[PDB]
Amino acid sequence: DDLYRQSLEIISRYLREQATGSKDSKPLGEAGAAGRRALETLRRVGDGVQRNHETAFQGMLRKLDIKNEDDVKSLSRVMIHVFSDGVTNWGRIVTLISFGAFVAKHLKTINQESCIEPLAESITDVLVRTKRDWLVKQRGWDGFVEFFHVE
Amino acid sequence: DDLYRQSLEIISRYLREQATGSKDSKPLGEAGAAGRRALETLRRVGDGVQRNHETAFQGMLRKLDIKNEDDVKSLSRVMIHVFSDGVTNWGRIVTLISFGAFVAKHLKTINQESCIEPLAESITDVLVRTKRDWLVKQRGWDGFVEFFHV
Amino acid sequence: RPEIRIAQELRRXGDEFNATYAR
Amino acid sequence: DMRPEIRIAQELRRXGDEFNATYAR
Structure with a gap:
């Protein structure tokens, strides 16, 4: 499942660097140029x-009270509910990933960095395994880059 | 003080329309040309x-616990703090007025409509009485309309 | 559930954000 | 008073500046 592996690599790397504050120079392994731009x-x-919704996100994280690995499945349930109206677009997708990065920052703060990888896999699972055909029709991560292109 | 009267009219009308949910056709009285487009x-x-920050605003309103007319002056204190870095721009101003309308909606919900006018006056007081020269240099509400032109 | 409410908030935010890039 | 008002102001200031930048761009 190349699409899952490529997607996990991008989302995992973003959540990691957000939680640590450091952009890793390690090259993308399973993303092939398109992943670097993504x-x-x-x-x-x-x-x-995250800058636009920091305070809202804080409240959501508080209500969810994610403290360890078995709590990540609540973010999975939330993402499933988001898409339950049958609508899919990149704004929704990137808002969920950004909330994921916010949660990862919190997990690192409370000495729970081990939960960041399972969090990334949970997010990628919902995206790729329930939205596969839509992603492929958008040409995957290339469509993501094009959609958010800055003039 | 024409600038105060023009500004109060605009902000008062917007807060009242938001609280009732009904766009009043009453013409603006002391706002001239700029007032209508503003x-x-x-x-x-x-x-x-308000759509962008509904949930954040709800939390803010909860922490402020605005229940009656004495509590209305806390928004003006919040506005003073917002501008305490010496920076002024229309994004800040409109974000404060939008939170004011969000509060006005709440006041109506708790049968405190009498507090909406004092809230509008407190907002207008901070804007016009502490940022007068900046507003005049921006060409007042005409600059507001141009800045947000689509 | 709190999860359903949080999802509605994230969906709204997502759609507002999508619209600034779609046009 | 001072403490919650100051934190709320910082949030509104941030929001205000993020929004301003989408039009001043």
Whole structure:
């Protein structure tokens, strides 16, 4: 499942660097150039979403009270509910990833960095395994980069 | 103080329309040309700010615990703090007016409509009485309309 | 559930954000 | 008073500046 592996690599890398505050120079292994531009786009757009909704996100995280690995399945349930109206678009997708990055920052703060990888896999699972055909029709991460292109 | 009267009229009308949910056709009285387009712009931009920050605003309103007329002056204190870095721009101003409308909606919900006018006056007081020179340099509400032109 | 309410908030935010790039 | 008002102001200031930048761009 190349699409899952590529997607996990991008989302995992973004959540990791957000939680640590450091952009890893390690090259993308399973993303093939398109992933590099996607991560670059996700940094710009994902960071802006977090700045726009930081206080809202804090309240959501508090209500969810995610403290360990078995709580990540609540973010999975939330994402399923988001898409339950049958609508899919990149704004929704990148808002969920950005909330994921916000949660990862919190997990690192409370010495729960081990939960960041399972969090990323949970997010990628919903995206790729329930929205596969839509992603493929958008040409995957290339469509993501094009959609958020800055003039 | 024409600038105060013009500004109060715009902000008062917007807060009241939001609280009741009904766009009044009553013409603006002391706002001239800029006033008509300003309320139109404030409706578009202000409604979008509230959509963008509804949940954050709800939490803010909860922490402030505004229940009656004495509590209304806390928004003016919040506005003073917002501008304490010496920076002024229309995004800040409209975000504060939009939160004011969000509060006005709440006041109506708890049968405190009498507090909406004092809230509008407190907002207008901070804007006009502490940022007068900046407003005049921006060409007042005409600059507001141009800045947010679509 | 709190999860359903949080989802509605994230969906709304997502759609507002999508619209600034779609046009 | 001072403490919650100051934190709320910082949030509104941030929101205000993020929004301003989408039009001043």
